[model samples]
Target: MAEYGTLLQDLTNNITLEDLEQLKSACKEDIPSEKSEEITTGSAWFSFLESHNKLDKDNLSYIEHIFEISRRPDLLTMVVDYRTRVLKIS
Candidate 1:
């Protein structure tokens, strides 16, 4: 829980173990299985940030602006914690 503290706090509601398992499965099904150094910047991504209430429209192209999103750290924490757990289980 300590590692996922930020993520758990950021969530609007509590999640069950089952929910986390489902989320993990869904991610595996949807996320790409590849590696790339390329970072794509597109108008849709900018709009996606706006739709999620991430950053101000003017700061769209700025990478640092992504950190300004209220739950960015929380999201990162969740990913970190998830990876740790997954690795251990595997």
Candidate 2:
């Protein structure tokens, strides 16, 4: 889960377009076809994001703030509560 989130963050924030193109070529499929490749992608991207705190704090804050300001009460509340619970757990 952490890995997946981090991958999303890193891919969005760090890896260059050319590198992303190479990754896409390596995968060959529009979507991941194997669990192992998926795992590798997840780990690499995630570690990069986690190392920079890009995924956890910056990205999440943006999303949470957007949801809050968008007036989507349910989603805002859900994310807020989830963050609270996750923080308490950590």
Candidate 3:
């Protein structure tokens, strides 16, 4: 319950897994024309076009900012924690 309480707020504010799934479904309509260097390096990209459906700039940037935080080695936990608080994870 401690962790759940900690996460309840953030989950209410951001995209949940369901939202992500729905976004993915909706994104199939628009394909990206630009090629990324990451993909050129064999980034396991079955669909580079799918990235066009990502969340808004601020939200995506928030994730990216958290990603750069090296002090916390367990970034996935950080992401999960944030997701739980802001996304109503199921």
Candidate 4:
């Protein structure tokens, strides 16, 4: 857990395993398919994505794009809230 750790945790909790796979595939450009297949939980992805530079402390563009492509508005809403409330961005 980092800056918006709780928010990231909440998002992963609501996402299904199927959607996780879809999300991983969508980010295949940044993360390799081999490594993606190795991971099983969404919680772990927070660090993984961050380490790969896809996710940062305040920036949510890449994350928003991931959820959007995976069709996960539930997760996207949480992200938007974090951006608006935590980051104080519109």
List TM-scores for all candidates, in order: 0.24, 0.35, 0.23, 0.85
Task: Give the per-residue lDDT of model 1 (tens digit) for 1-90.
Answer: 342333333332333344433332333322232311111222223233344454343332232323223234544454455546745863
How well does candidate 4 match the true structure, expressed as C-alpha RMSD? Answer: 2.5
List, residue by residue over 1-90, the lDDT tens digit for candidate 4: 354787788888887888888878878788877778767888766667977888876778879888888888878888987777765642
Q: Which residue segments of model 3 deviate by more than 4 Å? A: 1-34, 38-50, 54-73, 88-90
lDDT by residue (23-43, candidate 2, tens digit) is 434433323434224434434
Clash number for each model: 0, 0, 6, 0
List of clashing residue pairs for candidate 3: 7-85, 10-85, 10-86, 11-85, 11-86, 11-87
Off by over 4 Å in 1: 1-71
How far residue 43's Cα lies from its native spot in candidate 1, in Å, is 17
Residue pairs of candidate 1 with colliding backbone atoms: none
- The ten-residue window of minimal lDDT in model 2 covers 27-36
Candidate 4's C-alpha runs over 4 A off are 88-90
lDDT of 1: 0.35
TM-score of 3: 0.23
Every candidate's lDDT? 0.35, 0.45, 0.37, 0.79
Task: Please give the TM-score that candidate 1 achieves against the real structure.
Answer: 0.24
